[PDB]
PDB file of N, CA, C and O in Angstrom:
ATOM      1  N   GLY P   1      91.212  -9.411  84.597  1.00  0.00           N
ATOM      2  CA  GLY P   1      91.302 -10.777  84.116  1.00  0.00           C
ATOM      3  C   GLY P   1      91.099 -11.795  85.221  1.00  0.00           C
ATOM      4  O   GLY P   1      91.467 -11.556  86.371  1.00  0.00           O
ATOM      5  N   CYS P   2      90.511 -12.935  84.873  1.00  0.00           N
ATOM      6  CA  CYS P   2      90.259 -13.993  85.844  1.00  0.00           C
ATOM      7  C   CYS P   2      90.601 -15.360  85.260  1.00  0.00           C
ATOM      8  O   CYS P   2      90.081 -15.747  84.214  1.00  0.00           O
ATOM      9  N   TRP P   3      91.477 -16.086  85.944  1.00  0.00           N
ATOM     10  CA  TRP P   3      91.890 -17.411  85.494  1.00  0.00           C
ATOM     11  C   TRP P   3      92.337 -18.271  86.669  1.00  0.00           C
ATOM     12  O   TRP P   3      92.792 -17.771  87.697  1.00  0.00           O
ATOM     13  N   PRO P   4      92.207 -19.598  86.518  1.00  0.00           N
ATOM     14  CA  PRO P   4      92.594 -20.556  87.558  1.00  0.00           C
ATOM     15  C   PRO P   4      94.106 -20.627  87.747  1.00  0.00           C
ATOM     16  O   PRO P   4      94.871 -20.336  86.826  1.00  0.00           O
ATOM     17  N   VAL P   5      94.531 -21.016  88.944  1.00  0.00           N
ATOM     18  CA  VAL P   5      95.951 -21.127  89.252  1.00  0.00           C
ATOM     19  C   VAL P   5      96.241 -22.388  90.060  1.00  0.00           C
ATOM     20  O   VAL P   5      95.409 -22.865  90.830  1.00  0.00           O
ATOM     21  N   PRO P   6      97.450 -22.941  89.880  1.00  0.00           N
ATOM     22  CA  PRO P   6      97.879 -24.153  90.584  1.00  0.00           C
ATOM     23  C   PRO P   6      98.103 -23.909  92.072  1.00  0.00           C
ATOM     24  O   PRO P   6      99.143 -24.273  92.621  1.00  0.00           O
ATOM     25  N   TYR P   7      97.120 -23.294  92.721  1.00  0.00           N
ATOM     26  CA  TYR P   7      97.212 -23.002  94.146  1.00  0.00           C
ATOM     27  C   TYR P   7      96.035 -22.144  94.602  1.00  0.00           C
ATOM     28  O   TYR P   7      95.462 -21.371  93.834  1.00  0.00           O
ATOM     29  N   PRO P   8      95.667 -22.281  95.885  1.00  0.00           N
ATOM     30  CA  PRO P   8      94.556 -21.527  96.474  1.00  0.00           C
ATOM     31  C   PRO P   8      94.879 -20.043  96.624  1.00  0.00           C
ATOM     32  O   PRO P   8      95.937 -19.661  97.125  1.00  0.00           O
ATOM     33  N   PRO P   9      93.947 -19.187  96.181  1.00  0.00           N
ATOM     34  CA  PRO P   9      92.684 -19.631  95.582  1.00  0.00           C
ATOM     35  C   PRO P   9      92.886 -20.275  94.214  1.00  0.00           C
ATOM     36  O   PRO P   9      93.601 -19.739  93.366  1.00  0.00           O
ATOM     37  N   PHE P  10      92.251 -21.422  94.005  1.00  0.00           N
ATOM     38  CA  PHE P  10      92.360 -22.137  92.740  1.00  0.00           C
ATOM     39  C   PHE P  10      91.862 -21.276  91.583  1.00  0.00           C
ATOM     40  O   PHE P  10      92.176 -21.535  90.421  1.00  0.00           O
ATOM     41  N   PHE P  11      91.083 -20.250  91.910  1.00  0.00           N
ATOM     42  CA  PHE P  11      90.537 -19.351  90.900  1.00  0.00           C
ATOM     43  C   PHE P  11      90.989 -17.915  91.149  1.00  0.00           C
ATOM     44  O   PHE P  11      90.775 -17.365  92.230  1.00  0.00           O
ATOM     45  N   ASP P  12      91.615 -17.313  90.144  1.00  0.00           N
ATOM     46  CA  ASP P  12      92.096 -15.942  90.254  1.00  0.00           C
ATOM     47  C   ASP P  12      91.182 -14.984  89.495  1.00  0.00           C
ATOM     48  O   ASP P  12      90.619 -15.335  88.459  1.00  0.00           O
ATOM     49  N   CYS P  13      91.039 -13.772  90.022  1.00  0.00           N
ATOM     50  CA  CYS P  13      90.192 -12.762  89.397  1.00  0.00           C
ATOM     51  C   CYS P  13      90.535 -11.368  89.916  1.00  0.00           C
ATOM     52  O   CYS P  13      90.498 -11.115  91.119  1.00  0.00           O
ATOM     53  N   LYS P  14      90.869 -10.468  88.998  1.00  0.00           N
ATOM     54  CA  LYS P  14      91.218  -9.098  89.359  1.00  0.00           C
ATOM     55  C   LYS P  14      90.318  -8.100  88.638  1.00  0.00           C
ATOM     56  O   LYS P  14      90.739  -7.405  87.714  1.00  0.00           O
ATOM     57  N   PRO P  15      89.051  -8.024  89.070  1.00  0.00           N
ATOM     58  CA  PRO P  15      88.067  -7.111  88.480  1.00  0.00           C
ATOM     59  C   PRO P  15      88.366  -5.650  88.800  1.00  0.00           C
ATOM     60  O   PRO P  15      89.066  -5.348  89.767  1.00  0.00           O
ATOM     61  N   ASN P  16      87.833  -4.749  87.982  1.00  0.00           N
ATOM     62  CA  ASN P  16      88.043  -3.320  88.179  1.00  0.00           C
ATOM     63  C   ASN P  16      86.952  -2.724  89.064  1.00  0.00           C
ATOM     64  O   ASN P  16      85.955  -2.200  88.568  1.00  0.00           O
TER      65      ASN P  16
END
């Protein structure tokens, strides 16, 4: 899953 977050990295992503 990949989604933005209130902190750097502003963009989250945990690919397989």
